[PDB]
Design a protein around this ligand. Structure first.
Ligand SMILES: OC[C@H]1O[C@H](O)[C@H](O)[C@@H](O)[C@H]1O
Ligand SMILES: OC[C@H]1O[C@H](O)[C@H](O)[C@@H](O)[C@H]1O
Ligand code: NA
Lengths: 346, 339
């Protein structure tokens, strides 16, 4: 079933229930996921209205871009030309600049395919918006099906050569309570290397480092507490995880990551080369989610994209987008129950 | 009474009915007026869904900007520096360039004051959007009251020196049907001068012309057909009216123009110095409004703003907006019925 209602400020809430009874909801404010529940329990973090997003934190569950992450000094080179983008984090351009796409009302249309329901959000980034050459016609399609798969399909075409590398900023918290840390969740991640940050400004260091057999090695499932309790420099620097992980094997067919808690697992598939993981290292900020003060480590993201830093480390990729060339990216989050035995205590 | 409903593509339709039974409706798609009707008749032109605006004509009823009108070569000088804006009509920048503020969904809040209801729409234009320096935080408040006054109040703040001169683009048609020409309406307008156009490109010619005692003198009520049947080169050039008229006396208290058809009249008030009047000179285009094929001259606008062409005729004014200054503008359309 599909249901729609006003969500505040002119945005709407689109809520779907599949045949298994799982419900998921989105809003056109930032083409974002608001909630995902199973048996009355929240699997992700979200607010109860639009204003909350605008007043507390506008990134959760949103579509962010045109470029996700930080671009050092907001400088990119596009077809031999240097362009300076909007700098909203010191000299850095973070998640596309200020008042970016995650803050806009996108138009949308819903398509019911029976076993699958699609929500296609559209927006146009005018040429020159926040310094990005355009115009860029973008669309984000979120779909949910009877197999409990939530898929995000991105498409974009630009009138001018530009850069494009958006991602989805959902936060998972299988505890269903923001006040409960994710340290008790199990993580499996198919990545042997990571990208270290230079310092507190969080720009990339310049190197790629192998993490095998360190507390950041999750090729084999381990509790998140291992990472959180680590005194590895990188962990101390950010007070948790806030890094890009390079996937070892590319392809939409491979389970790149799996997040488990008791009998629930979330699997991650994507066609992108990296996964930026940030564990809500907010300290005592205590943002209120459903009236629960969020704890430090009270959430975890899986931002699938080309790794941030390619400006400095060319080996990570190329996010340029040529005029008229069609961009596409697909990321899928699927839910399962009893995929494995996960019985621990913290 | 206030009613909110889906208007398509995620846009909302907000309808306000006052004590008098008059209904006015707006959409956040482009902070726009969609309808205005008394005793079952539409007073303005509008569509029945969001899609139509996007497919047919996105300007009707909309808030247009940042700059209303045509800018020659898309060129503006800011702090002595040349800036090229998006060009969407040949080399001109018309109505802020392509995919401008009129095609975006604005956020909004409704405030019910009893005798008056206000709908405040907001949108942030990012720095660099379509070539315009910013960011510009804008709000347009459309309000409707028990006295049948529809007021538009604009406010904006920019982080950087920029240009700003928006307008409301509603088209009136008291016939209540687009297939009927407004030639039968009577118009009165408090302007003794106008800005002629250079040619079919519609950029300004360069001068200011006195219209006293010409077919465009509406200082004294007159019927539209007059202007429409004139042989003035300017009328013939565009096949109607598509020009900036310079108000003789500025101030919101003065009735600047009045559009009348029989018992029903529309008065216009503004704090702007000019009114751009365009009579839907679309020829055979035939756009469909409520299933009715539109006729050449099947509508008329009253675009209150600083006249277009200031880039070439400074006397017209200046649309500069300095960083941190607060822009304000007010335009009122008051409805009256003779008893
Ligand atoms: O809260 C936004 C969040 O977005 C990304 O995950 C960044 O890596 C984090 O450092 C933080 O900026
Ligand atoms: O249709 C848009 C409309 O906008 C303004 O009124 C112009 O002066 C008219 O020529 C026309 O372009
Ligand atoms: Na809506």
């Amino acid at each position: 079933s599909i249901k729609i209602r006003d969500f505040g400020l002119g945005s709407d809430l689109i809520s779907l229930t599949n045949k298994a009874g799982v419900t998921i909801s989105f809003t056109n404010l930032g083409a974002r996921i608001v909630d995902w529940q199973k048996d009355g329990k929240h699997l992700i973090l979200g607010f109860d209205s639009a204003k909350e997003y605008l007043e507390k934190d506008a990134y959760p569950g949103a579509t962010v871009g045109p470029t996700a992450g930080r671009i050092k000094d907001g400088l990119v080179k596009i077809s031999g030309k240097d362009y300076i983008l909007n700098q909203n984090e010191g000299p850095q351009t973070l998640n596309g600049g200020e008042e970016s796409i995650h803050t806009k009302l996108w138009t949308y249309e819903v398509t019911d395919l029976g076993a699958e329901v699609q929500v296609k959000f559209s927006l146009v980034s005018n040429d020159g918006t926040n310094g990005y050459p355009g115009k860029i016609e973008m669309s984000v399609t979120h779909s949910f099906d009877d197999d409990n798969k939530w898929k995000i399909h991105y498409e974009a075409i630009s009138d001018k050569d530009t850069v494009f590398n958006p991602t989805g900023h959902v936060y998972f918290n299988l505890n269903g309570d923001a006040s409960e840390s994710v340290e008790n969740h199990g993580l499996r991640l198919a990545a042997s290397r990571f990208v270290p940050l230079k310092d507190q400004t969080e720009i990339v260091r310049g190197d790629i480092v192998d993490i095998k057999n360190t507390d950041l090695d999750f090729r084999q499932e381990k509790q998140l507490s291992n990472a959180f309790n680590s005194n590895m420099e990188q962990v101390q620097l950010v007070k948790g995880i806030d890094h890009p992980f390079l996937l070892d094997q590319l392809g939409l067919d491979k389970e790149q990551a799996r997040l488990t808690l008791d009998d629930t697992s979330i699997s991650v598939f994507t066609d992108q080369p990296s996964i930026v993981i940030f564990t809500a290292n907010f300290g005592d900020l205590g943002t209120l989610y459903h009236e629960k003060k969020q704890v430090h480590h009270g959430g975890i993201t899986f931002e699938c994209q080309v790794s941030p830093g390619s400006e400095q480390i060319p080996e990570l990729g190329d996010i340029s987008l040529k005029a008229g060339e069609k961009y596409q990216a697909t990321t899928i989050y699927s839910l399962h129950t009893k995929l494995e035995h996960h019985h621990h205590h913290h």
